[model samples]
Target: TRDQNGTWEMESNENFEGWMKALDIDFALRKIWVRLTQTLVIDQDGDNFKVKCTSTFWNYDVDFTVGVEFDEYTKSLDNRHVKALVTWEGDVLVCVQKGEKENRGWKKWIEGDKLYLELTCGDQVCRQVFKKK
Candidate 1:
């Protein structure tokens, strides 16, 4: 098992534009987000978690408990409301976002000192790798 309670700085992203398009994010915002260096700060306490996605242009925070579904309003990224649930599958933290789009969710895992995120929407999948900071 991996400990995921630290700040992770974005190192690379793949197919992010396609995933953003699937989320209906505006082209202008996508252009800005694609180049921004995003950082994720995760705080975990037992089954509770708080996640913060930070960047120079935008920032968002989400707080939830494992196995508990809650309403989530994506602020800067998509600006949509959805029911979100996060659960652990082995060493991976998997989140399912129930909204208008199909197959919209994310999964996170840690390997060594690096963190990996997989964002999914429709037929698009975005992979982001982060280094512990």
Candidate 2:
């Protein structure tokens, strides 16, 4: 299991559009993505957590540990497939996507009442913001 952070149950979602577009996803995919439901299942053990982004069209599941690097398979966006690694930098969660693109993936942070996420793919970069629910 994992902990969201000190005294925080979840990151506040914020300014998330740029990150999405960086993936080179089409307009139709974007529409569905905006409406999709995401659920974070934090494992209390801190070694594992499962974050699931679900939609009527597709679902993405990411599982990893804090410092222990592991491989990740992305089924969303390009659909070309790749490997990823997620690590925790202080309270900020950082992810680096490895494959065809250079400096790809996302980083998540929480400040005040907002959740800020930066997503990057190839040469494009995107930022996403979300409000706490």
For model 1, the stretches where C-alpha displacement exceeds 4 angstroms are none
**Top candidate (lDDT):** 1
For residues 19-131, write the lDDT of model 2, one tens digit per residue: 55666668677766664545433333555666654446675666677566566555556775566778877878888877877888788777765656677766655555654
- What alpha-carbon RMSD in Å does predicted model 1 have with respect to the real structure? 1.0
Clashes of each: 0, 22
Work out the TM-score per prediction: 0.95, 0.66
Worst 10 contiguous positions by lDDT, candidate 2: 1-10
Model 1 clash tally, residue pairs: 0
What are the candidates' C-alpha RMSDs? 1.0, 4.3
Tens digits of lDDT, candidate 1, 1-133: 5479999999999999999999989998899888789999999899999889999987788889999999988886688998999999999999999998899999998998899999999999999999998
Judge candidate 2 against the unseen true structure and give its global Cα lDDT, from 0 to 1: 0.60
- Worst 10-residue lDDT window for candidate 1 reads 72-81
